[model samples]
Target: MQFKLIINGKTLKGEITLEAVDAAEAEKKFKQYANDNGIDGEWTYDDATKTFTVTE
Candidate 1:
């Protein structure tokens, strides 16, 4: 399945492609992205389409 990572930040708002085997790993990828970019926000995962959205 394809994973979509939505980045929501003060100066950022878009989607990022992520590779993951499962939702747990997807969350891990999300945290890694946040840590790497120094950003944190609300997020949701859609199992139907494997989409992750982070709201600013």
Candidate 2:
């Protein structure tokens, strides 16, 4: 799924995946994606559940 993550009042096109365990892992994965394609952002993850999402 995709989320509208606003940082510093700027909306970023945050794209996430269903396979991700949480936003922290998402953040790390995102960072890796960024390193590959030059994208950037700071995100967080929750490990309390098997699946984590911006919606939940």
Candidate 3:
């Protein structure tokens, strides 16, 4: 499946594309992506919409 990650930061905002077999894997990949990209924030995933909303 495909997932969309919406990032909302104080000085940065954008979207990320992610592919995974399930929400759990997608979230795991997102965590790594965030860490690698230095994106620190609180996030929530919506299964119905398959989107991750992150606030920093």
- The most accurate candidate by TM-score is 3
Model 1: CA > 4 A from native: none
Off by over 4 Å in 3: none
Worst 10 residues of 2 by lDDT: 1-10
How would you encode candidate 3's per-residue C-alpha lDDT over 1-56 as one tens digit per residue? 89989988776699988789999898999889888778899999999989998899
Tens-place lDDT digits, model 2, residues 1-56 = 33222222133344444345445655555456545654444444444533222321
TM-score of 3: 0.88
lDDT of 1 by residue, 1-56 (tens): 46888877887788888788998888888878877887778888888888888776
lDDT of 2: 0.42
- Arranged by lDDT, best first: 3, 1, 2
| Local distance difference test, candidate 1 | 0.81
- Winner on TM-score between 2 and 3 is 3
RMSD in angstroms between candidate 1 and the native structure over all alpha carbons: 1.2
